[PDB]
Design a protein around this ligand. Structure first.
Ligand SMILES: [Mn+2]
Ligand SMILES: [Mn+2]
Lengths: 161, 161
């Protein structure tokens, strides 16, 4: 079994998510926002203009919300970027959490970060690990609300296989 | 350029230093202790019974003392073991420092640890890095003395090439 200690990690290249499969989400908006848009999957496409947004139209789901991605590949995760909705939007996400897994069974958390609905990308210095699965979670305990929206999720690191 | 953050590192296997070349030391004892024994190189042989010991016989060198090893290989360093002289010896090393390098030019420190002249090996949870060169240093500033002796240095990690 492992432990958590310090590393020298280089700032890593983006891992370009052609392929990549959202394979479980708590909530998405299959209508309100576009139709083509709002889905969990809008999060790991190429498209900026397309964002994931929690269900709000005709119902909403209680927090917490999360999204598990298969990156189809073992990878040394170094950073995690979130392009927020920004553009003067009501996106009152105060806190986000990341975890990762090699199996999609035993999860290990790689940090809890503040969120800011800025237009630029949020660079998040996660605890690096070898992983194929990341789970973005919007926790039940942050001052987070049901309103939550994210244009893109990106993973900086190296490929290692 | 890099930075220092947290990693999940597994407790690593020993890297078995057949090959490996001490390629610079501050001090060794080419006489007092055995003749065959006391040398910097006694530090990265197989042999327990053979230890490095700072020059003491007919002269001694002022602190600090260090020893640079080529491991002949890029390696993700996870831990560092020092078998001390122990066996009720006067080995009043209070502090040790490690650094590592890919080039043997730009060095990066991977920790400053307490030393204890116990008989068992000292496991040292260094800051992991990719490296071919480690430098063991006995610093000028520890309460360390000219008397310093070490049976073996070992490196736990993975090979990565
Ligand atoms: Mn998008
Ligand atoms: Mn020895």
């Amino acid at each position: 079994d492992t432990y958590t200690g310090f590393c020298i990690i280089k700032e890593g290249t983006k891992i370009s998510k052609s392929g990549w499969e959202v394979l479980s989400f708590t909530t998405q908006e299959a209508s309100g926002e576009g139709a083509g848009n709002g889905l969990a999957k809008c999060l790991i496409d190429g498209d900026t203009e397309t964002f994931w947004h929690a269900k709000w139209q005709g119902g909403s789901d209680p927090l917490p919300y999360d999204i598990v991605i298969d990156m189809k590949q073992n990878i040394q995760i170094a950073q995690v970027e979130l392009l927020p909705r920004g553009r003067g939007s009501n996106n009152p996400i105060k806190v986000v959490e990341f975890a990762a897994s090699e199996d999609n069974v035993n999860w290990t958390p790689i940090g809890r970060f503040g969120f800011t609905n800025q237009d630029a990308a949020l660079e998040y210095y996660v605890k690096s690990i070898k992983a194929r699965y990341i789970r973005l979670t919007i926790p039940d305990d942050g001052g987070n609300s049901t309103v939550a929206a994210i244009r893109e999720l990106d993973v900086k690191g190296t490929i290692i296989n």
